[PDB]
RNA sequence: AUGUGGAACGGGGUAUUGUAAGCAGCUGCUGAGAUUAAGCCUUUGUUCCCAAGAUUUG
RNA sequence: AAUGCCGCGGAGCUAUCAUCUGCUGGAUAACGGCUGAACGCCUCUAAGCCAGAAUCCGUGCCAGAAAGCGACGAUU
RNA sequence: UGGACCCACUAAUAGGGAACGUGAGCUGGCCUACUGAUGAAG
RNA sequence: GGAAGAAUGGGCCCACUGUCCCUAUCUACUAUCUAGCGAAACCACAGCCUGGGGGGCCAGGCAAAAUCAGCGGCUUGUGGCA
């Protein structure tokens, strides 16, 4: 499972894809497993599965409401050890509902929270920081 | 809106927390206390191993915010008797000690110095003249009454507070027969009861106090009682080795550098509580043993602190003690 | 070859690391996996239950051999001290501070020959060669930088991605001086390293691995006898 | 373990400060908010008077080991002796700098 | 499982040891339960109990014995709605005793008013001419405005 | 989905309509409000009936869309022509109900008074009830069809299979029961296995579906299944004639059934002893026959330790069980002193990471440093 | 309403800014200077203040 | 220079942008039964009893009658 | 429940009433309540 | 985060922003008190709620002065005809 962690990627936001599948920019549509809260747009963060559309990339891949896992976040969130973490940008991965990415590599460091939650993401990761 | 139960949102009628619910008596158990009242000084954060079975964070390192509450030992000054009646608990009689601490005398007087200090004067003489009368009253307590509470007061002199009035309150004595409680109360007259008597560095306590005031419905200054809130450590500041975590050694004192914000320097027995507590700093708080009996793993697990932080809470402090500070900083002109 | 799953996932390689002389297991998870490892090779080789950097991805992040074991520099010093206490004295553990944090996923090492990602630093390669006492070659597996995760290496055989060319597979096998088979495990999963772990005398695969894949792995690793 | 600040070059205790990682797998820890903003603005520590880097370069200043009871006991006393000896040299250095 | 998979388990393992006396016990005490039903429940489900109890009661008795300016009414072709307009009637022959849906060839006379007869409004008791070749005037024996169908007797 | 009775379905539909839609409309409101209330109740009634009919149609499959083996078995064992007729009658009834509801809604759109609406509301319900009551036998056929379909197995002709057919009680069922974990009951009465039994089996890392067939409606079903199936014939002939059929009769039956056995591997099993002799009485040769039928259908040395050449869960479960058991890492340590292993260590003292600045050589270095410091001081 | 009393100041500790003015010769003074409780901690520091006025009370 | 402009900026305020905590006993409905007549059988019911719902009522939580009350200190 | 009959989450996105629902909360085609704050008095 | 309700604005796109998520903080004034000055509308009599015939009637619930501040007022699930 995953503990409470700061949400900072609400719907109607543009978020960058960091794999080799050819996708470049990702548009958030909806968030999996969100409660029925009143007047609160669901958000996303590292290790969270959300519904997103590929804005730019390969034409066949885009125009599909597909699950996406965020791997990088600008917002500063606290890790349970007590240290606050923030990244230079927001990065995500192109993944099927089963939990498998079409791409075969990732770019740059990878949050361990995303890596530990999804074991095959750690398999594709080469730099876990 | 908020909870309907907590209505009305009126300011508390008591400055200090009142324990309305007390643990059920058990004559099979030995005589023991149930409630404590200390003073909230401030808070810090500590580093602690998290030995939670089955959790994902099992046997590893976690950071937990803690609160520091100074608890100087009280002085038992009297006992009261209570009779179970068709109208509820009724106060039968009350017996006190001889030499009341001078702070207690401040409680009875709104203008102590102007008053002629006539409180309990004739009671003192009548005790020295004939202890038979007191013995008769204690006979009344041990024979007729069913619930016994001892009169205890905070001993504020050794605390670093401008206030000089002792906070008087009653603590249930649960365990043993009625005569056993009275005899325990009698043998504890005029003496001090330490915090280590009731809490054992890992126990299930309920912190009570009046929350802080945000000003104007009313917003703030209500009575509150928090549950759970496990204890992390019952320090003994009289020992110079009070904080002194075994993992880190690093000889230190609980008092943060420059003193606690708006409180001062903690010197006496203090209790470490996880999370937060109702009420702002330098306010009297009340603790009590948890009413219910729950063996949940979050309430039964042992705690062995790894490292506590004694940095400068005033501003963005970054130094634990001057001993470790001086050699890091270049030798200044002073 | 033994088929088992960690928690509810068969990706044993991510959650555990198996060497020719020691075994790495996670902490705080399902105790059945530790019991299975102990019953399989616990009495033969040590099995250490600890987390590197407070994570259960030690198998997919740490790389090592029977001679030496390498861990990311981000691992806690307290974790390192516990590892040395658990591990035998003849086992060498060295911290690696390189641009690649996932030592296991980037480089797969055998008892004699090791293949690392081309992006590995020269100092890290020298440290890896010094620690593991094996030859380290910077190359790519199936055109993928993550050679340590998309391919599996063992003394008696090697497993590569099914998309690898025959000539490339033959070249890699000749370079590794061991037989190589290109295929998929865990019912078509292409992460052979993440989905399979094989030692010199024992092999542990996912509980969901296909029987045909298990039979192929046993023949390739000569683990039938 | 208390890390060393990237900009302030001071002790960093757990909890306080922030951790910043880079694309090149380089993680920088900032001791305080001012230090983090100092690294945010790319202020040179050698060009910052209140930084140990300038204080040093301006004339102003992996293999685990098996535990042993005797080694641990002597390590603590040696550290105290090392600090006492090191502090005296700085006082002499400051006196020489003043003179 | 396959085919009547629970019918060889009973064949090979045996029956619930205490099913038959439980069902015998249930088949016995249900008499008291049935009476208690009528003495407690209220509402429609109690009303549904009533006539269904009497239905099986009388049936049991039988076996043992054997032992704006617009037209507000339907019209035939103010404003007359097309939906209100009807051209087919399920006229039932009297002597034949067979109800047949016959087209409304025309309306003879409307007893309500001559204006309604002029407008061809279909009303109860109105005389309408229908072709009988497949088998003549006929009187409407029902109100199509409420029944929703042109029910008439030859 | 389960098929309810005609009376029960009407009551459930009526009850659901009353429970969901409001039932309190005072006559003092507007005519449109009364018209809207009546129409909503009618629309809800139409929707509930439409949902039930659509669910029945979706649940009911298409005989043509089924596989050739499944469709033939369905036609033989369920009279697919009759089933198709009933489904069309239900579909026609659903369409007729929709047309009636639309006509009633249009009539309700021009409502005049509450009594007119009330009479219209009753009229629509009665017409729907009569249509539902008329479609009574269709529900019974659907319920029987659903029960038969549920009891029916999932045929997989694509995978490897072994069809056992021949004289009844010739031991083919016994061989099938032995080969596969599926156990079909056998009785002395002939044609005991009314329906085919399929048992999965593993051989040479391959999945084989051992499917039994009725001895020779059951015979017709067995013939149809063997007509369209990628499986090998397992004609078992009683060599000892203990199955009640003569050897010549079995041979004649096998020759007659050979048109269905064409384009498949034929095995001649000599029961009660490819021509394979299998002693049905002695239960010998069953494995050999199955194997024959399955075949017919088809410098880095390893440092193996001496211990390798030659539990934790139980321990945790016994003490406190999972989630209540804490494993101590001190025990799993190679520290020389057991007291040292079970004891803590100094992590960081006086602002310095002592664990990161303590080395084994410091034991002698400290003494040397102490001597060096004294010399420097002197 | 005479005290480990109160107060105003000041010292120390703690903190923010960034190394002053000036003396000078970027460097030294100088990781300085300034601010630091007005809702921070402490006071053997100097000073004065007070064993006071009115009102209602069986 | 009507708080000229800019950086940092303690203390305060606030942050589902930061953290902590959020029970336990009885009586019940549906319902499952037991004993047992009515009714020499039978029967959860008639006289009775047992079990059983996020239900009900208490336990805890807050207010504390400003015309409810008690113990206790002094009382010009 | 979030967005223009729809398309996704979620455990579900139940039906109503306040007879001109709440148009003297809302838009388009003095006194008495309630909340708080004091309060003389046996 | 960037239209989910300041930018310089530029060429549906791009940029921008508390429109919104989701409000938080500050300053000033008003508000508030004190001193002084000081109205008018309006006024049968007044003022606690449930039910029955509204605030005055009947039967109930209750009921403690003086005041300050924010602020309301029959119908349902079953068609008709022969």
UniProtKB/Swiss-Prot annotation, chain A:
GO BP of this protein: cytoplasmic translation
Compartments (UniProt record): Cytoplasm; Nucleus
Pfam family, one: Ribosomal_L14
SUPFAM superfamilies: Ribosomal protein L14 (SSF50193)
InterPro entries, A to Z: Ribosomal_uL14, Ribosomal_uL14_CS, Ribosomal_uL14_sf
Keywords: Cytoplasm, Nucleus, Ribonucleoprotein, Ribosomal protein
SMART domains: Ribosomal_L14
Gene Ontology annotations for the cellular component aspect, listed alphabetically: cytosolic large ribosomal subunit; nucleus; preribosome
GO molecular function, one term: structural constituent of ribosome
Organism domain of life: Eukaryota
Family, per entry: Belongs to the universal ribosomal protein uL14 family.
Note in the entry: There are 2 genes for uL14 in S.pombe.
HAMAP family: Ribosomal_uL14 (MF_01367)
Known partners and oligomeric status: Component of the large ribosomal subunit (LSU). Mature yeast ribosomes consist of a small (40S) and a large (60S) subunit. The 40S small subunit contains 1 molecule of ribosomal RNA (18S rRNA) and at least 33 different proteins. The large 60S subunit contains 3 rRNA molecules (25S, 5.8S and 5S rRNA) and at least 46 different proteins.
Name of protein: Large ribosomal subunit protein uL14A
Species of provenance: Schizosaccharomyces pombe (strain 972 / ATCC 24843) (Fission yeast)
From Swiss-Prot, chain C:
Record's keyword terms, sorted: Cytoplasm, Initiation factor, Nucleus, Phosphoprotein, Protein biosynthesis, Ribosome biogenesis
Pfam families the record matches: eIF-6
Keyword Ligase: no
Modified residues (Phosphoserine): 173-174
Subcellular location: Cytoplasm; Nucleus, Nucleolus
GO biological process: assembly of large subunit precursor of preribosome; cytosolic ribosome assembly; maturation of 5.8S rRNA; maturation of LSU-rRNA; ribosomal subunit export from nucleus
Subunit composition and interactions: Monomer. Associates with the 60S ribosomal subunit.
Protein role: Binds to the 60S ribosomal subunit and prevents its association with the 40S ribosomal subunit to form the 80S initiation complex in the cytoplasm. Is also involved in ribosome biogenesis. Associates with pre-60S subunits in the nucleus and is involved in its nuclear export.
Protein name: Eukaryotic translation initiation factor 6
Species for this entry: Schizosaccharomyces pombe (strain 972 / ATCC 24843) (Fission yeast)
Gene expressing this chain: tif6
From Swiss-Prot, chain E:
Top-level taxon: Eukaryota
Protein location: Nucleus, Nucleolus
Start-end of Basic residues biased regions: 12-27
Protein's GO biological process: assembly of large subunit precursor of preribosome; maturation of 5.8S rRNA; maturation of LSU-rRNA
Pfam (any one): Ribosomal_S8e
Annotated InterPro entries: NSA2_fam, Ribosomal_Se8/biogenesis_NSA2
GO cellular component: nucleolus; nucleus; preribosome; preribosome, large subunit precursor
Motif placement: Nuclear localization signal: 10-17
Keyword Ribonucleoprotein: yes
Disordered as annotated region, ranges: 1-33
Binding partners and assembly: Component of the pre-66S ribosomal particle. Interacts with ppp1/nop7 and nop52/rrp1. Interacts with rsa4 (via WD repeats).
Purpose: Involved in the biogenesis of the 60S ribosomal subunit. May play a part in the quality control of pre-60S particles.
Family: Belongs to the eukaryotic ribosomal protein eS8 family. Ribosome biogenesis protein NSA2 subfamily.
PANTHER family: RIBOSOME BIOGENESIS PROTEIN NSA2 HOMOLOG
Protein name: Ribosome biogenesis protein nsa2
Gene: nsa2
UniProtKB/Swiss-Prot annotation, chain F:
Entry GO terms, CC: mitotic spindle; nucleolus; preribosome
Molecular function GO terms recorded: GTP binding; GTPase activity; RNA binding
Location of the OBG-type G domain: 160-298
Binding residue positions for GTP: 166-173, 212-216, 271-273
Cell compartments where the protein resides: Nucleus, Nucleolus
GO biological process, one term: ribosomal large subunit biogenesis
Domain of life: Eukaryota
Broad class of the protein's primary localization: nucleus
Alphabetic keyword roster: GTP-binding, Nucleotide-binding, Nucleus, Phosphoprotein, Ribosome biogenesis
Task performed by this protein: Involved in the biogenesis of the 60S ribosomal subunit.
Family statement drawn from the similarity comment of this UniProt entry: Belongs to the TRAFAC class OBG-HflX-like GTPase superfamily. OBG GTPase family. NOG subfamily.
Protein name in UniProt: Probable nucleolar GTP-binding protein 1
Gene that this polypeptide is encoded by: nog1
């Amino acid at each position: 499972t995953k503990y409470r962690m700061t949400l900072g990627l609400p719907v109607q936001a543009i978020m960058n894809c960091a794999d080799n599948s050819g996708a470049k920019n990702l548009y958030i549509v909806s968030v999996f497993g969100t409660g029925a809260r009143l007047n609160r747009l669901p958000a996303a963060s590292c290790g969270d599965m959300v519904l997103a559309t590929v804005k730019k990339g390969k034409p066949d891949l885009r125009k599909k409401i597909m699950p996406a896992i965020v791997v990088r976040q600008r917002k500063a969130w606290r890790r349970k050890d007590g240290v606050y973490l923030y990244f230079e940008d927001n990065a995500g991965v192109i993944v099927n509902p089963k939990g498998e990415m079409k791409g075969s590599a990732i770019t740059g460091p990878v949050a361990k929270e995303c890596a530990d939650l999804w074991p095959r993401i750690a398999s594709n990761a080469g730099t876990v920081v | 809106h908020g909870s309907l139960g907590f209505l009305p949102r009126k300011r508390a009628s008591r400055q200090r927390g009142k324990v309305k619910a007390f643990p059920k008596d058990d004559a099979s158990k030995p005589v023991h206390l149930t409630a404590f009242l200390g003073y909230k000084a401030g808070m810090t954060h500590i580093v602690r191993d998290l030995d939670r079975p089955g959790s994902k964070m099992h046997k590893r390192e976690i950071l937990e915010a803690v609160t520091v509450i100074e608890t100087p030992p009280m002085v038992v000054v009297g006992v009261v008797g209570y009779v179970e009646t068709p109208r509820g608990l009724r106060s039968l009689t009350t017996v006190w000690a001889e030499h009341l601490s001078e702070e207690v005398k401040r409680r009875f007087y709104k203008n102590w110095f102007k008053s002629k200090k006539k409180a309990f004067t004739k009671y003192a003489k009548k005790y020295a003249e004939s202890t038979q009368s007191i013995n008769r009253e204690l006979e009344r307590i041990k024979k007729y009454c069913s619930v016994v509470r001892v009169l205890a007061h905070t001993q504020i002199r050794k605390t670093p507070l401008a206030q000089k009035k002792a906070h008087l309150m009653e603590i249930q004595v649960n365990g043993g027969s009625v005569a056993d409680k009275v005899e325990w109360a009698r043998e504890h007259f005029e003496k001090t009861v330490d915090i280590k008597s009731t809490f054992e560095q890992n126990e299930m306590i309920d912190v009570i106090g009046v929350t802080r005031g945000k000003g104007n419905g009313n917003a703030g200054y209500m009575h509150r009682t928090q549950l759970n809130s496990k204890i992390y450590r019952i320090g003994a500041g009289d020992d110079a080795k009070n904080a002194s975590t075994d993992f880190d050694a690093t000889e230190k004192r609980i008092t943060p550098m420059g003193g606690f914000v708006r409180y001062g320097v903690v010197e006496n027995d203090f209790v470490m509580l996880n999370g937060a507590t109702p009420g702002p700093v330098k306010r009297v708080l009340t603790l009590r043993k948890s009413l219910l009996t729950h063996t949940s793993r979050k309430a039964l697990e042992p705690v062995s602190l790894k490292w506590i932080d004694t940095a400068s809470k005033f501003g963005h402090g970054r130094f634990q003690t001057p001993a470790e500070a001086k050699q890091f900083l270049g030798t200044l002109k002073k | 070859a033994l088929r088992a799953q960690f928690e509810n996932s068969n990706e044993i390689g991510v959650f555990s690391n198996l060497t020719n002389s020691y075994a790495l297991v996670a902490l705080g998870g399902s105790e059945n996996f530790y019991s299975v490892f102990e019953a399989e090779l616990g009495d033969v080789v040590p099995v250490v239950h600890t987390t590197i950097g407070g994570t259960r991805i030690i198998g997919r992040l740490t790389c090592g051999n029977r001679k030496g074991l390498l861990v990311p520099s981000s691992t806690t010093d307290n974790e390192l001290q516990h590892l040395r206490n658990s591990l035998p004295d003849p086992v060498k553990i060295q911290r690696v501070d390189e641009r690649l944090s996932a030592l296991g996923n980037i480089v797969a090492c055998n008892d004699y020959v090791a293949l690392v990602h081309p992006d590995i630093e020269r100092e890290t390669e020298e440290i890896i060669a010094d620690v593991l006492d094996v030859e380290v070659f910077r190359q790519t597996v199936a055109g993928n930088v993550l050679t340590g995760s998309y391919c599996a290496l063992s003394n008696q055989g090697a497993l590569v991605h099914p998309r690898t060319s025959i000539q490339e597979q033959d070249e890699l096998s000749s370079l590794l001086q061991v037989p190589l088979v290109a295929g998929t495990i865990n019912r078509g999963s292409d992460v052979i390293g993440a989905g399979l772990v094989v030692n010199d005398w024992c092999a542990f695969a996912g509980l969901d691995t296909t029987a045909t894949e298990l039979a192929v792995c046993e023949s390739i690793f000569k683990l039938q006898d | 373990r208390v890390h060393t600040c990237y900009f302030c070059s001071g002790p960093v205790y757990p909890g306080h400060g922030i951790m910043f990682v880079r694309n090149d797998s380089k993680v920088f820890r900032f001791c305080r908010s001012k230090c983090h903003k100092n690294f945010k603005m790319k202020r040179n520590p050698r060009k910052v008077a209140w930084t140990k880097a300038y204080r040093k370069a301006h004339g102003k200043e992996n293999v685990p080991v098996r535990y042993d009871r005797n080694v641990i006991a002597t390590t603590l006393n040696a550290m105290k002796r090392v600090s006492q000896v090191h502090a005296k040299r700085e006082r002499l250095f400051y006196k020489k700098r003043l003179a | 499982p396959q085919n009547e998979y629970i019918e060889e388990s009973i064949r090979k393992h045996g029956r619930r040891f205490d099913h038959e006396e439980r069902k015998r016990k249930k088949a016995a005490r249900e008499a008291h339960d049935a009476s208690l039903y009528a003495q407690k429940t209220r509402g429609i489900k109690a009303k549904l109990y009533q006539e269904k109890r009497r239905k099986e009661k009388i049936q049991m008795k039988k076996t043992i014995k054997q032992h704006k300016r617009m037209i507000t009414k339907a019209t035939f072709v103010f404003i007359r709605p097309m939906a209100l307009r009807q051209k087919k009637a399920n006229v039932t022959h009297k002597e034949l005793g067979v109800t047949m849906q016959l087209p409304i060839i025309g309306v003879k006379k409307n007893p309500q008013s001559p204006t309604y007869t002029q407008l061809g409004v279909l009303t109860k008791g109105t005389v309408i001419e229908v072709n009988v070749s497949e088998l003549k005037y006929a009187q409407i024996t029902n109100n199509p405005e409420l029944d929703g169908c042109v029910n008439a007797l030859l | 989905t389960p098929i309810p009775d005609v009376n029960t379905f009407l009551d459930v539909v009526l009850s659901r309509t009353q429970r969901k839609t409001p039932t309190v409309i005072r006559s003092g409101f507007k005519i449109s409000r009364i018209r809207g209330f009546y129409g909503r109740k009618v629309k809800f009634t139409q929707d509930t009936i439409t949902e039930k009919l659509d669910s029945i149609l979706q649940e009911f499959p298409k005989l043509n869309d089924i596989h050739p083996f499944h469709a033939d078995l369905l036609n033989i064992l369920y009279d697919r022509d009759h089933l198709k007729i009933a489904l069309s009658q239900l579909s026609t009834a659903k369409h007729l109900v929709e047309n009636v509801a639309r006509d009633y809604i249009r009539l309700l759109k021009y409502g005049d008074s509450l009594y007119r609406c009330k009479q219209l509301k009753r009229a629509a319900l009665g017409r729907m009830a009569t249509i539902i009551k008329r479609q009574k036998s269709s529900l019974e056929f659907l319920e029987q069809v659903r029960q038969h379909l549920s009891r029916l197995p999932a045929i997989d002709p694509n995978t490897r299979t072994l069809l056992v057919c021949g004289y009844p009680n010739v031991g083919k069922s016994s061989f099938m029961n032995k080969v596969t974990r599926a156990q079909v009951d056998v009785q002395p009465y002939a044609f005991t296995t009314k329906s085919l039994f399929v048992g999965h089996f593993d051989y040479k890392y391959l999945r084989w579906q051992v499917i039994d067939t009725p001895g020779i409606t059951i015979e017709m079903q067995s013939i149809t299944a063997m007509a369209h199936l990628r499986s090998a014939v397992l004609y078992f002939m009683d060599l000892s004639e203990m199955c009640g059929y003569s050897v010549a009769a079995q041979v004649k039956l096998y020759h007659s059934i050979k048109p269905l056995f064409a384009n498949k591997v034929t095995i001649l099993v000599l029961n009660k002893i490819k021509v394979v002799q299998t002693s049905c009485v002695q239960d010998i040769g069953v494995m050999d026959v199955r194997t024959t039928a399955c075949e017919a259908l088809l410098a880095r040395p390893a440092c193996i330790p001496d211990s390798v050449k030659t539990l934790a869960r139980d321990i945790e479960a016994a003490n406190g069980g999972a989630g209540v058991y804490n494993v101590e890492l001190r025990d799993k340590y190679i520290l020389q002193d057991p007291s040292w292993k079970y004891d803590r260590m100094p992590e960081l003292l006086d602002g310095k990471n002592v664990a990161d600045f303590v080395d084994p050589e410091i034991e002698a270095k400290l003494l040397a440093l102490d001597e060096e410091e004294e010399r420097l001081e002197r």
